[PDB]
Amino acid sequence: PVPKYVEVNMTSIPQGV
Amino acid sequence: SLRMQHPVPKY
Amino acid sequence: THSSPTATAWEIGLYYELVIPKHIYLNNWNVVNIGHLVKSAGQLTHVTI
Amino acid sequence: QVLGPVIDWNVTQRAVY
Ligand SMILES: *[C@@H]1O[C@H](CO)[C@@H](O[C@@H]2O[C@H](CO)[C@@H](O)[C@H](O)[C@H]2NC(C)=O)[C@H](O)[C@H]1NC(C)=O
Ligand SMILES: *[C@@H]1O[C@H](CO)[C@@H](O[C@@H]2O[C@H](CO)[C@@H](O)[C@H](O)[C@H]2NC(C)=O)[C@H](O)[C@H]1NC(C)=O
């Protein structure tokens, strides 16, 4: 058990379009 | 915008 | 219209239809509706505009 | 007759750490 991390970016979709 | 740090196993 | 062993003649009738443009649009995108999930009084529901 | 939920497609608002 060793700490390893992956970066994950997220952005929005106005009105769901 | 939303930056995050997902932990992954390293055994 | 004429047919000899050394000579011929033909006629062709051609009909053309030319669309005259009003406006031309070049830089275009297709819409893709995705929507949103809502969990209401126990039921999962997909909502769209 | 109660007021129902509101949705605005904002991802930042729903972040869980
Ligand atoms: C992807 O992003 C992660 C962020 O978690 C990077 O993790 C860092 O890696 C370096 C080694 O180069 C460590 O010294 C840091 O402590 C890590 N940062 C953290 C945990 O916040 C990772 O290097 C990136 N991977 C790639 C392939 O670029
Ligand atoms: C989307 O959600 C985020 C988080 O709720 C909003 O960003 C915050 O805005 C307030 C001011 O209204 C600031 O005091 C906070 O510091 C902000 N938080 C973060 C994490 O940035 C944002 O305004 C919302 N709306 C839009 C359109 O992005």
What method did the depositors use to determine the structure? Answer: cryo-EM
Substitution target from B2, B4, B5 for chain D, most D beta carbons within 10 A:
B2
Angle value at C-alpha D15, between C41 and C44, nearest 5 degrees:
20
Resolution in A: 2.9
Per-residue tokens: D15: 């972040």
Q: Would you call A16 and C32 a contact, using CB atoms and an 8 Å cutoff?
A: no
Per the listing, tokens 């505009």 go with C49
**Cβ atoms D9, C36 nearer than 8 A:** yes
From ligand 2's centre to the CA of D13, what distance in Å? 7
What whole-number distance in Å separates Cα of residue B6 and Cα of residue A5? 5
Q: Would you call C36 and A16 a contact, using CB atoms and an 8 Å cutoff?
A: yes
